[PDB]
Amino acid sequence: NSVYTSFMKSHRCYDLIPTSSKLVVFDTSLQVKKAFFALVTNGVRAAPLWDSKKQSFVGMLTITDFINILHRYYKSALVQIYELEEHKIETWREVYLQDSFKPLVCISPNASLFDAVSSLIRNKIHRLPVIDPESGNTLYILTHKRILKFLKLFITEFPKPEFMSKSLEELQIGTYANIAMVRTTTPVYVALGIFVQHRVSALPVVDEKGRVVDIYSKFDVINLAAEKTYNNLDVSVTKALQHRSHYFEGVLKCYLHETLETIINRLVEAEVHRLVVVDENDVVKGIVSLSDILQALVLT
Amino acid sequence: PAQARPTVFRWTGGGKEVYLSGSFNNWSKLPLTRDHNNFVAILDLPEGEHQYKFFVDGQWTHDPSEPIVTSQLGTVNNIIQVKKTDFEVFDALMVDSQKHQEPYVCKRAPPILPPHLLQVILNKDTGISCDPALLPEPNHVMLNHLYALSIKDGVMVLSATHRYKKKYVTTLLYKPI
Amino acid sequence: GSVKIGHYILGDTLGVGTFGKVKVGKHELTGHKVAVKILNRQKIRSLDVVGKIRREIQNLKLFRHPHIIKLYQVISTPSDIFMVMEYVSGGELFDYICKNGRLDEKESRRLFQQILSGVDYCHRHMVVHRDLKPENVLLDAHMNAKIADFGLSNMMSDGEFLRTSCGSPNYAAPEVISGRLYAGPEVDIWSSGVILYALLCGTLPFDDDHVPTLFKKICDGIFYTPQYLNPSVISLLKHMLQVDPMKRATIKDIREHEWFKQDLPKYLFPEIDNRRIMNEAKDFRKAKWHLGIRSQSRPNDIMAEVCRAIKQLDYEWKVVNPYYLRVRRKNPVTSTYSKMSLQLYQVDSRTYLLDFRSIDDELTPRPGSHTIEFFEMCANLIKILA
Numbered sequence: 001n002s003v004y005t006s007f008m009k010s011h012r013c014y015d016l017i018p019t020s021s022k023l024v025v026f027d028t029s030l031q032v033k034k035a036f037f038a039l040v041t042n043g044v045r046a047a048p049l050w051d052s053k054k055q056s057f058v059g060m061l062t063i064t065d066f067i068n069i070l071h072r073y074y075k076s077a078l079v080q081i082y083e084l085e086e087h088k089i090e091t092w093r094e095v096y097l098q099d100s101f102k103p104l105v106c107i108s109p110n111a112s113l114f115d116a117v118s119s120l121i122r123n124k125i126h127r128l129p130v131i132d133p134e135s136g137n138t139l140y141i142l143t144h145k146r147i148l149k150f151l152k153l154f155i156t157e158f159p160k161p162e163f164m165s166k167s168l169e170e171l172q173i174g175t176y177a178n179i180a181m182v183r184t185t186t187p188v189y190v191a192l193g194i195f196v197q198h199r200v201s202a203l204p205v206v207d208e209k210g211r212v213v214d215i216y217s218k219f220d221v222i223n224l225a226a227e228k229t230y231n232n233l234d235v236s237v238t239k240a241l242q243h244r245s246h247y248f249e250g251v252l253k254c255y256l257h258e259t260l261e262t263i264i265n266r267l268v269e270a271e272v273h274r275l276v277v278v279d280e281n282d283v284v285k286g287i288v289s290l291s292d293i294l295q296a297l298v299l300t
Numbered sequence: 301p302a303q304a305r306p307t308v309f310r311w312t313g314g315g316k317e318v319y320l321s322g323s324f325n326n327w328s329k330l331p332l333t334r335d336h337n338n339f340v341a342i343l344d345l346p347e348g349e350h351q352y353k354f355f356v357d358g359q360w361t362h363d364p365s366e367p368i369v370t371s372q373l374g375t376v377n378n379i380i381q382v383k384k385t386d387f388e389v390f391d392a393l394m395v396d397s398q399k400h401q402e403p404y405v406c407k408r409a410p411p412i413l414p415p416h417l418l419q420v421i422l423n424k425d426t427g428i429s430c431d432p433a434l435l436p437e438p439n440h441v442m443l444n445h446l447y448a449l450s451i452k453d454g455v456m457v458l459s460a461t462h463r464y465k466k467k468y469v470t471t472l473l474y475k476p477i
Numbered sequence: 478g479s480v481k482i483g484h485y486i487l488g489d490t491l492g493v494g495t496f497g498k499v500k501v502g503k504h505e506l507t508g509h510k511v512a513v514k515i516l517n518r519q520k521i522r523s524l525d526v527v528g529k530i531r532r533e534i535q536n537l538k539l540f541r542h543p544h545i546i547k548l549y550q551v552i553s554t555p556s557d558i559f560m561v562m563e564y565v566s567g568g569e570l571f572d573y574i575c576k577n578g579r580l581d582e583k584e585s586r587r588l589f590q591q592i593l594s595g596v597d598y599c600h601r602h603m604v605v606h607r608d609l610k611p612e613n614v615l616l617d618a619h620m621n622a623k624i625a626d627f628g629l630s631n632m633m634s635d636g637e638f639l640r641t642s643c644g645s646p647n648y649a650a651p652e653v654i655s656g657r658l659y660a661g662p663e664v665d666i667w668s669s670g671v672i673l674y675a676l677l678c679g680t681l682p683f684d685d686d687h688v689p690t691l692f693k694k695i696c697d698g699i700f701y702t703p704q705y706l707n708p709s710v711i712s713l714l715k716h717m718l719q720v721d722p723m724k725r726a727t728i729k730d731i732r733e734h735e736w737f738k739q740d741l742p743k744y745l746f747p748e749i750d751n752r753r754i755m756n757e758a759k760d761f762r763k764a765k766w767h768l769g770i771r772s773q774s775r776p777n778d779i780m781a782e783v784c785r786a787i788k789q790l791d792y793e794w795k796v797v798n799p800y801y802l803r804v805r806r807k808n809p810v811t812s813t814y815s816k817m818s819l820q821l822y823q824v825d826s827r828t829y830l831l832d833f834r835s836i837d838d839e840l841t842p843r844p845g846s847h848t849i850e851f852f853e854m855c856a857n858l859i860k861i862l863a
């Protein structure tokens with residue numbers, strides 16, 4: 001095993017579930033626009049989907065789906081997006097998925113965290129709903145951030161391993177090639193197009209020089225639902241990002257020579273899902289995400 | 301071990317002297333000590349059939365309220381059956397307890413509403429620095445009850461808090477009308 | 478021969494319980510003293526408490542606390558059930574206050590801490606005593622409080638209220654003498670407030686020889702505060718003795734109160750692997766919800782209406798009470814049953830409210846979600862009644 005791998009095999013998912021939490025669920029017959037509003041209303045990123053006909057949880061609705069819908073059916077700021085307004089979750093699931101393959105990926109509360117970290121990486125999803133086999137009820141929605149936050153406290157207790165001592169280039173952790181980025185002047189629609197094709201959680205915003213001046217993430221997109229500005233995707237990411245409430249600190253960055261330990265502290269402190277690796281010039285060399293780091297500690 | 305099983309012999313009535321005689325003591329006279337109108341002795345008896353009688357102030361009698369047996373010679377004794385089920389507490393409570401309304405049919409004041417149920421867990425605002433999915437710890441009395449939102453845009457919103465072990469989950473369902 | 482059970486020789490009567498009598502007992506070898514509660518089996522059958530007795534025995538058996546009377550063993554016989562309990566020689570707190578008068582502030586606080594510690598421990602174990610009063614609080618040779626006589630107690634269930642009137646009028650909360658429903662920890666707290674007063678003043682806060690006057694005094698929440706009482710403890714009494722149960726102090730509130738915290742021993746209140754996991758977790762305009770469905774219409778009207786709508790949806794029901802129904806729906810897909818309770822309540826004179834409460838299933842792993850099936854079951858009915 002690994003030092004940290006032993007820990008993850010020990011603890012059940014129940015260990016992560018908070019004392020009292022809120023869970024939102026959507027009937028698949030629900031108008032898909034109303035659903036994305038609900039996610040905003042209740043302040044949650046994802047929700048399980050329930051089919052009354054099948055009496056089962058068929059799948060999960062996330063902000064990625066909102067991005068897929070916007071990009072597919074957006075035509076111009078002058079014409080409303082009919083499919084967003086008219087469709088139901090089941091209708092768009094049938095359109096989006098021609099294949100009958102994709103099942104709902106769930107985990108039991110008794111199952112260990114290691115098994116949970118595996119399943120997130122296997123299907124490459126960021127949401128794992130925890131379902132009790134006996135009751136049939138969905139208990140909690142597990143995420144990368146929840147899990148790393150848990151480990152971080154445990155990582156401090158255990159004796160410092162050599163991995164943490166080594167620098168990020170030596171460690172080879174993260175994605176250093178084929179980086180999806182956008183210009184300051186890039187339209188949101190084009191940015192959305194890039195989300196769909198690269199399937200990445202966030203796009204660094206770079207200037208003419210190559211330096212990162214900002215970051216545009218799938219989370220920033222949900223703001224379109226919030227302010228009901230989704231009808232106009234022609235605006236630049238820069239104008240769209242002005243709407244972020246938190247007055248902006250410079251983009252969170254890390255360096256190649258910096259230790260894995262240093263980085264995990266910076267990520268977990270800031271609660272952002274990824275870090276941007278850069279040259280002194282601020283030119284983007286790559287991305288380190290939670291999924292990368294957990295894939296390191298799950299295997300390595 | 302299972303040969304010693306505690307049995308209460310109680311005579312309800314007045315007397316200067318009360319004695320117990322049975323098969324178990326070879327029909328000797330065992331004096332019963334008194335509390336008010338109760339004379340008692342407690343004895344360990346083997347599982348099986350046992351016959352007994354009382355001697356109360358110079359008169360042989362049996363307890364009329366307890367079971368009796370009658371000999372072909374005309375002797376009238378009390379009889380008692382020692383059962384192993386009598387000596388385990390929960391087994392004996394099971395026997396004491398022994399001693400289909402589902403089909404729907406064609407067919408006072410209403411209890412005043414307990415104010416506990418008007419504490420709505422979702423109407424409670426939480427802090428801006430914490431995860432929005434998180435909630436306050438519920439009163440156990442609030443659990444399993446149904447809460448709802450006024451129907452709007454042809455959509456109904458239902459909610460209830462249920463417990464799983466030491467954890468609680470408040471579930472919201474969005475269903476169209 | 479003497480009266481002897483489990484090697485203990487039965488002595489003098491200490492008092493009379495709900496069942497039988499409680500007697501002292503003395504070990505034939507060591508001379509150890511115990512308290513033996515005698516429960517006559519034909520008596521517990523007469524008023525059928527048999528299950529209520531079995532649950533009291535199960536619960537009390539597990540209890541281990543210094544300020545609650547311990548249940549050592551339960552011994553069964555053909556005629557009788559013997560409960561062997563710890564014996565404390567000091568007797569009732571009530572008798573103590575009668576003989577010695579009010580206790581000073583430090584002694585009152587010391588005892589009130591021990592008692593509330595016991596009450597809390599019961600509540601943490603989902604048990605409400607409901608008979609709390611100085612007659613039910615005993616004392617050992619060292620003046621440690623011991624809560625006794627759980628005969629009127631009850632276990633707290635999820636989503637359930639208790640209607641049972643209990644305890645002495647002097648120690649009963651306004652909702653209890655008014656016959657209203659209650660969750661029950663707030664009732665033990667009210668009683669504990671009356672006990673606290675008795676300790677400090679040597680008298681009862683609500684007492685009258687005229688019973689209707691006594692009930693009014695209780696529902697008014699008005700009582701006399703002697704000049705010698707610390708203003709600090711007066712505020713604590715005011716909070717514990719709040720008429721409105723929603724405004725009434727909780728055990729958390731009392732532990733935070735300054736008068737209570739003084740001199741407080743560490744052992745009294747609870748606050749390995751399981752503890753560590755909990756610590757980790759803890760370290761890591763708007764919509765307006767409302768309960769059930771309301772109708773300004775009449776109670777016989779709204780009851781008939783529900784039954785009609787239940788029948789329309791093919792559901793089956795039992796009328797357990799005029800205003801309380803148990804419903805069972807067959808699920809077409811899973812071919813299983815989903816049960817819920819309906820109760821009507823009165824919001825005010827002009828308004829009534831129907832309540833939906835899910836009933837936990839018997840079943841081991843089965844298809845679909847209980848919580849959702851519960852929602853769908855209600856949804857169908859609500860659409861009709863809306």
Ligand SMILES: Cc1ccc(Oc2nc3cc(-c4ccc(-c5ccccc5O)cc4)c(Cl)cc3[nH]2)cc1C(=O)NO
Binds near residue numbers: 308334496497517
């Ligand atoms: C009214 C009544 C009638 C019968 C009843 O059931 C029983 N009452 C019982 C009384 C006794 C008992 C125990 C001990 C002594 C005794 C004898 C000598 C010296 C000291 C003693 O305590 C006397 C009687 C025994 Cl061993 C078993 C008993 N079972 C209970 C009750 C009742 O509910 N009292 O509140």
Ligand SMILES: Nc1ncnc2c1ncn2[C@@H]1O[C@H](COP(=O)(O)O)[C@@H](O)[C@H]1O
Binds near residue numbers: 064106
């Ligand atoms: N637990 C899950 N089971 C099935 N599909 C999922 C699950 N989580 C996410 N998805 C889908 O995977 C895609 C990516 O979602 P995200 O996890 O937000 O990147 C979306 O189209 C979701 O509908």
Ligand SMILES: Nc1ncnc2c1ncn2[C@@H]1O[C@H](COP(=O)(O)O)[C@@H](O)[C@H]1O
Binds near residue numbers: 178290
């Ligand atoms: N902007 C990006 N360009 C290229 N790869 C990325 C980018 N963001 C994340 N990744 C990689 O995509 C995978 C999933 O990351 P995430 O979408 O952040 O969960 C990881 O291997 C990341 O290193």
Ligand SMILES: Nc1ncnc2c1ncn2[C@@H]1O[C@H](COP(=O)(O)O)[C@@H](O)[C@H]1O
Binds near residue numbers: 251253271274
């Ligand atoms: N590396 C970063 N630097 C600055 N802000 C970020 C970074 N990553 C995410 N954010 C912000 O965090 C929010 C979304 O976080 P997440 O969905 O966890 O990526 C958005 O407001 C982003 O602009």
